[PDB]
């Protein structure tokens, strides 16, 4: 039957502005195959992500791994835009990251 | 511990995609090219003591994919296959051998001792199926010699030749961050742990020596270098958050744990 991707988003380093990092989305859980998965730069997409060849669980359901390497800075804002037919629309998972306490 | 998985999505009559890959423990080592005919070999140790063997490897794949795929398309409408489907199978062995295969994500034939065996769920559709696969018996007498005997083989040139990979130590390191802050007055604190390998690994919130047992640990998720990466959060009151420290204990580290406190601008301080 149909199931419905999970999607997690993380880096490979702890955030620090103008050093460069990794940024994975693993996308797992899901069935079928078929699945469009994009990786995002303040709402914009990333040109020549790299994902992991498909493999799947001992429940069958699929799994990838995209990511990239990336400098993030201040203002930049990174998430994890995902479809498949198990969704009405297209579900962005952001990159939770600190930018340390606000008021100075 | 090596297994093959195989992945076969039929669009339509005219249109299919074919993916395989081999598995030693949980590491990627072969890929097929699809294009190319070939396997394509991921690490130099995935060549095992067999040299130039693999040409009959690649021509016996390359000749039972033939087969398959012409005879799921010869059959699809005598087995009730609709389009468009998928065919999933792995294969593998360890003392243990196993060869399963799924219909649109379900369990529908397994190869057990000398021939295809239907699950009693898949219905009528999976007998008819195993009578196809078991249509020539020299056929699964030679899936049976791969599984209990090619296999053994495949394992000695590659575990030994690629034991300093498994094997290798890896330190993790450790951050914390905060987290997307369920419920109103409270806080959710993420300790992330990245980089270590094997995957083995203990990470707990802690106030002094009492374990929280508070600490949500999330999936063990991959890199793309080959470590993992893992996050645990815990959800505390705005006001209790004094004196936590996230634990991280790992083989790589040798009982020098990884302790992180959560200070600084985490709290924030004055
Ligand atoms: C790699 C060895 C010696 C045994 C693993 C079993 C195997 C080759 C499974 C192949 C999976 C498959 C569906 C192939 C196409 O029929």
Redesign the pocket.
């Known amino acids: 039957i149909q199931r419905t991707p999970k999607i997690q988003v993380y880096s490979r380093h702890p955030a620090e502005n103008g050093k460069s990092n990794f940024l994975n989305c693993y996308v797992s859980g899901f069935h079928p195959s078929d699945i469009e998965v994009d990786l995002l730069k303040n709402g914009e997409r990333i040109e020549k992500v790299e994902h992991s060849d498909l493999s799947f669980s001992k429940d069958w359901s699929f799994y990838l791994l995209y990511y990239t390497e990336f400098t993030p800075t201040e203002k930049d804002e990174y998430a994890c835009r995902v479809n498949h037919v198990t969704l009405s629309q297209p579900k962005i998972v952001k990159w939770d990251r600190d930018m340390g306490s606000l008021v100075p | 511990s090596?297994?093959?998985?195989?992945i076969?999505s039929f669009y339509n009559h005219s249109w299919k995609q074919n993916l395989?890959s081999?598995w030693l423990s949980d590491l990627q080592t072969?890929t097929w090219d699809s294009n190319s005919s070939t396997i394509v070999f991921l690490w130099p140790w995935s060549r095992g003591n067999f040299s130039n063997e693999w040409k009959e490897?690649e021509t016996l794949?390359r000749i039972?994919?033939i087969?398959?795929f012409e005879g799921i398309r010869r059959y699809a409408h005598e087995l009730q296959f609709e389009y468009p489907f998928e065919?999933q199978?792995?294969?593998?062995?360890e003392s243990g051998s196993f060869?399963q295969?799924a219909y649109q994500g379900s369990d529908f034939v397994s190869f057990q001792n000398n021939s295809w065996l239907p699950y009693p769920v898949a219905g009528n559709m999976a007998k008819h199926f195993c009578k196809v696969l078991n249509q020539n018996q020299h056929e699964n007498d030679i899936?049976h010699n791969?599984?209990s005997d090619?296999?053994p083989?495949?394992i000695l040139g590659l575990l030994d030749a690629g034991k300093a990979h498994l094997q290798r130590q890896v330190k993790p390191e450790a951050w914390l961050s905060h987290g997307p802050s369920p419920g109103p007055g409270h806080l959710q604190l993420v300790c992330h742990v990245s980089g270590f390998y094997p995957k083995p690994v203990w990470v707990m919130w802690m106030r002094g020596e009492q374990e929280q047992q508070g600490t949500q640990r999330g999936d063990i998720l991959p890199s793309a270098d080959g470590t993992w990466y893992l996050r645990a959060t815990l959800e505390v009151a705005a006001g209790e958050a004094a004196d936590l420290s996230c634990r991280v204990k790992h083989s790589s580290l040798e009982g020098q744990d990884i302790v992180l406190y959560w200070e600084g601008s985490l709290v924030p301080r004055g």
């Open positions: 090596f297994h093959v998985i195989w076969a395989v081999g072969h490897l794949f039972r994919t087969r398959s065919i199978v792995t294969g593998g062995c060869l295969l899936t791969l599984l090619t296999c083989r495949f």
